[PDB]
Amino acid sequence: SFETRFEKMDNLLRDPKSEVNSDCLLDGLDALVYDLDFPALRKNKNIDNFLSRYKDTINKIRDLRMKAEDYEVVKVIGRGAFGEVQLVRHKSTRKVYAMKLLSKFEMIKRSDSAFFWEERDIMAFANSPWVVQLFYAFQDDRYLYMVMEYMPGGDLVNLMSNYDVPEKWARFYTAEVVLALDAIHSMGFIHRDVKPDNMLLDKSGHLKLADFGTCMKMNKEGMVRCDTAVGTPDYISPEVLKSQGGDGYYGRECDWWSVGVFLYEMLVGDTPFYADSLVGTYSKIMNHKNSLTFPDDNDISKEAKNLICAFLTDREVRLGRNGVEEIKRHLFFKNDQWAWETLRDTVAPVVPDLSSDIDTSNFDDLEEDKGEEETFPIPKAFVGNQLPFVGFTYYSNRRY
Amino acid sequence: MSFETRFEKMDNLLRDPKSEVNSDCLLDGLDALVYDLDFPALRKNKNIDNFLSRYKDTINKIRDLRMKAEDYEVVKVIGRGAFGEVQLVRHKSTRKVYAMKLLSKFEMIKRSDSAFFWEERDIMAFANSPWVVQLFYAFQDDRYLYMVMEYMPGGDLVNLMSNYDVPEKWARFYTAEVVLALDAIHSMGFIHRDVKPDNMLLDKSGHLKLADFGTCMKMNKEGMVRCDTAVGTPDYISPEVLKSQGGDGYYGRECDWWSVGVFLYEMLVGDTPFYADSLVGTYSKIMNHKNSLTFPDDNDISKEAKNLICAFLTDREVRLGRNGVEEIKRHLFFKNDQWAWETLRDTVAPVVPDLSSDIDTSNFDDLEEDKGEEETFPIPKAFVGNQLPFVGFTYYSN
Numbered sequence: 055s056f057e058t059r060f061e062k063m064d065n066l067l068r069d070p071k072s073e074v075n076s077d078c079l080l081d082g083l084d085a086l087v088y089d090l091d092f093p094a095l096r097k098n099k100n101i102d103n104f105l106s107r108y109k110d111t112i113n114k115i116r117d118l119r120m121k122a123e124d125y126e127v128v129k130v131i132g133r134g135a136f137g138e139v140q141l142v143r144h145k146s147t148r149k150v151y152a153m154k155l156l157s158k159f160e161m162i163k164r165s166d167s168a169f170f171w172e173e174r175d176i177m178a179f180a181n182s183p184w185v186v187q188l189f190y191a192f193q194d195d196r197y198l199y200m201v202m203e204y205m206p207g208g209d210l211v212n213l214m215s216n217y218d219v220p221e222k223w224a225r226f227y228t229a230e231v232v233l234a235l236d237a238i239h240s241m242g243f244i245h246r247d248v249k250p251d252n253m254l255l256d257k258s259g260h261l262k263l264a265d266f267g268t269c270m271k272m273n274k275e276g277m278v279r280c281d282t283a284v285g286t287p288d289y290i291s292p293e294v295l296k297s298q299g300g301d302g303y304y305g306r307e308c309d310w311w312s313v314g315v316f317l318y319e320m321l322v323g324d325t326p327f328y329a330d331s332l333v334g335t336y337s338k339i340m341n342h343k344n345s346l347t348f349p350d351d352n353d354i355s356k357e358a359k360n361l362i363c364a365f366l367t368d369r370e371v372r373l374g375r376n377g378v379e380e381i382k383r384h385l386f387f388k389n390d391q392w393a394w395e396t397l398r399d400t401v402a403p404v405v406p407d408l409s410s411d412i413d414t415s416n417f418d419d420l421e422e423d424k425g426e427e428e429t430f431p432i433p434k435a436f437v438g439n440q441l442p443f444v445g446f447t448y449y450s451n452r453r454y
Numbered sequence: 455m456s457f458e459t460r461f462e463k464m465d466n467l468l469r470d471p472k473s474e475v476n477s478d479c480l481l482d483g484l485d486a487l488v489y490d491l492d493f494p495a496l497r498k499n500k501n502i503d504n505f506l507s508r509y510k511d512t513i514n515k516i517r518d519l520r521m522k523a524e525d526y527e528v529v530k531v532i533g534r535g536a537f538g539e540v541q542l543v544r545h546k547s548t549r550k551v552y553a554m555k556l557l558s559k560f561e562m563i564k565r566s567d568s569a570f571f572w573e574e575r576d577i578m579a580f581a582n583s584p585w586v587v588q589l590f591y592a593f594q595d596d597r598y599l600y601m602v603m604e605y606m607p608g609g610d611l612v613n614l615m616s617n618y619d620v621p622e623k624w625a626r627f628y629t630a631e632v633v634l635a636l637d638a639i640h641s642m643g644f645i646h647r648d649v650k651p652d653n654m655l656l657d658k659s660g661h662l663k664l665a666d667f668g669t670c671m672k673m674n675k676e677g678m679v680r681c682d683t684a685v686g687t688p689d690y691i692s693p694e695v696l697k698s699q700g701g702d703g704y705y706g707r708e709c710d711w712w713s714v715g716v717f718l719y720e721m722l723v724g725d726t727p728f729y730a731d732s733l734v735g736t737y738s739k740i741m742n743h744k745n746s747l748t749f750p751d752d753n754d755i756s757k758e759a760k761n762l763i764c765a766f767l768t769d770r771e772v773r774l775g776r777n778g779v780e781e782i783k784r785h786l787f788f789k790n791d792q793w794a795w796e797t798l799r800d801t802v803a804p805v806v807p808d809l810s811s812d813i814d815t816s817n818f819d820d821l822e823e824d825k826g827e828e829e830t831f832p833i834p835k836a837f838v839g840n841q842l843p844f845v846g847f848t849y850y851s852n
């Protein structure tokens with residue numbers, strides 16, 4: 055019909071998950087103008103005329119759409135790998151966010167993942183109190199921008215370094231991770247990189263999973279076929295670490311191994327497979343049968359050791375192989391201050407005391423500023439460097 | 455402006471027909487970028503290969519759903535127009551009858567002239583005037599531009615003059631409808647530059663409408679325009695436009711009124727005032743119009759008709775219509791007892807066409823057939839971008 059087609063086209067122009075919605079189309083044009091505005095390309099009449107035909111148009115667009123100078127940077131609160139995270143206040147709305155910058159040139163400089171799609175998809179659609187929420191995602195010719203919610207309570211690395219964690223706290227934080235990972239699994243993902251660095255606390259001190267860069271979609275039988283290893287040396291499971299080109303076929307059990315590593319560290323103060331060099335940790339992980347020991351200290355309850363050992367074993371016998379409910383039924387979690395279905399409604403072990411909406415006391419101080427880093431080299435022929443980032447924008451077509 | 459404003463102004467742009475960033479225009483830029491990249495030589499780059507691999511499924515389904523060529527059933531070819539043909543079509547779904555104009559993308563690019571269609575698309579779609587042929591739908595593919603206009607079953611004025619020895623009453627009517635039609639085009643901010651009986655079409659009631667605006671240009675601050683183009687058929691073209699063979703001259707709207715004078719002369723005499731066997735002969739006679747403009751030795755043409763023709767066929771500086779359109783209307787040639795200017799298009803036309811069906815193409819001569827296969831593009835070894843000049847041409851109506 056002449057109307058069905060008009061409607062079906064309109065479903066593709068609106069759907070927040072359409073590859074051709076208003077966001078993706080405004081990006082597609084925006085990418086082209088960027089990837090053509092070079093003197094060596096302006097020699098072509100078509101390219102030259104098109105840019106001048108759209109010059110006044112494309113500027114009005116870039117002024118109306120969400121851009122970087124719409125935000126007032128308060129302080130940098132994290133940096134490294136492919137950019138930095140900074141506490142920002144939206145100049146217009148005065149609302150406070152945590153904005154993550156991703157270097158386009160750096161990611162294209164051999165990263166082999168295009169991982170940001172998974173992270174953008176989860177944070178924007180998870181709709182879970184256990185997941186850090188994405189509000190806006192925009193871009194330019196140099197950086198990707200993820201406007202997430204601010205977590206003023208800081209991460210779990212900061213918490214463990216300032217407190218000798220008692221069991222009551224450990225049980226709480228382990229249980230919040232178990233529920234958080236269960237929510238991620240329900241969406242159809244294996245996290246593959248569970249660690250205190252990725253665990254952030256809100257203004258009440260409740261846990262949320264942040265950064266889903268290593269996330270991959272599970273198949274029908276809930277497995278992942280990956281030939282190269284992914285994760286962190288201390289928290290990586292034996293099967294993901296040895297995962298070879300032979301198969302590299304593992305389930306969600308790898309996430310529960312990392313939860314056990316997380317629990318061990320909270321109580322002992324060290325990683326279960328620590329060594330002098332990085333390569334030593336590796337031999338100790340493969341040898342978890344004989345390397346996993348508890349230091350002589352009478353403060354780790356029987357149930358704590360039981361749970362850690364149930365998580366820190368081979369995939370075939372590992373706790374959590376028979377679903378999440380058997381982890382919840384474990385005696386370590388048996389307490390009298392909360393229940394699983396009402397856990398995130400109870401008072402947290404460490405409620406943070408905040409001075410203002412911009413209180414960054416729980417984040418270690420950094421220099422900021424930098425000095426505008428190097429991006430893509432100026433093309434001599436049409437390269438199309440902005441094409442792999444078309445549709446990353448989450449602004450015009452977002453879910454409400 | 456607030457956040458709610460900056461968002462909503464942007465959101466309104468994607469639904470605004472007059473916007474260059476509207477949903478249909480954005481779908482073009484993506485549809486175009488796929489065509490101008492899907493070549494094995496450019497597939498070598500991963501940024502390009504990864505782009506096409508993702509938007510593969512999407513761009514096909516989009517192309518099938520949007521208004522395409524096979525949505526129309528061609529009834530009969532009714533006109534040839536340099537870059538392509540005009541054909542009477544019936545929309546398969548709605549059964550509505552239109553005149554669709556095709557324009558060869560390769561042919562346009564081949565001989566420059568690939569920007570004139572913007573002026574024609576903008577006028578026909580937004581003019582909203584009973585004197586202007588209306589554009590309903592404008593779509594495209596990788597080869598042709600498509601302009602779905604209203605069908606004019608009455609035919610053109612070329613056909614009329616060849617079948618009748620036009621009397622003055624008729625000439626007065628048709629001249630007055632052109633004057634009002636061009637005045638409506640000037641009011642939008644345009645100089646037609648190509649006023650001729652080929653471009654004047656009659657509706658089902660036999661009333662005039664200007665069709666084909668492929669040479670219209672936007673007037674600057676002073677209401678003038680610069681230009682430089684190899685002129686086709688100088689018969690109706692003015693001295694000033696002819697003396698501007700290379701941007702070496704600015705001219706106003708008075709060049710349109712000269713063409714009206716040529717139009718009136720032809721209706722009464724039966725021939726163009728500056729006709730010659732060669733194209734350069736016509737030009738030479740137009741330049742020497744001070745001495746070449748003559749009248750037949752039979753006083754069939756009245757005093758006022760001669761007065762008006764001579765008033766239109768003089769130098770720009772003294773030409774009638776320089777002081778506005780109202781002095782053309784006040785002329786004694788138009789003095790009649792059948793109609794008034796403000797109610798002219800409501801009166802009964804001198805020739806009301808008798809139509810058999812909604813597809814009665816009796817007022818249009820049969821067209822032969824090109825019998826010639828159209829030239830295509832060579833497979834690029836780089837990025838030529840032979841789709842960018844046709845981005846944002848797609849137009850729909852509510």
Ligand SMILES: O=S(=O)(c1cccc2c(O)nccc12)N1CCCNCC1
Pocket residue numbers: 131132139152154186202203204205206251252254264265
């Ligand atoms: O992007 S982060 O998740 C991150 C760091 C600091 C504050 C945040 C915050 O407040 N909200 C969301 C994410 C945040 N992060 C931690 C993982 C390691 N790499 C990126 C920095």
Ligand SMILES: O=S(=O)(c1cccc2c(O)nccc12)N1CCCNCC1
Pocket residue numbers: 532533534535536540553555587603604605606607652653655665666
């Ligand atoms: O496009 S045309 O305006 C043209 C020709 C024949 C029928 C039409 C019709 O019915 N409607 C609109 C335009 C039409 N045209 C005449 C001008 C010369 N070149 C293009 C063809």
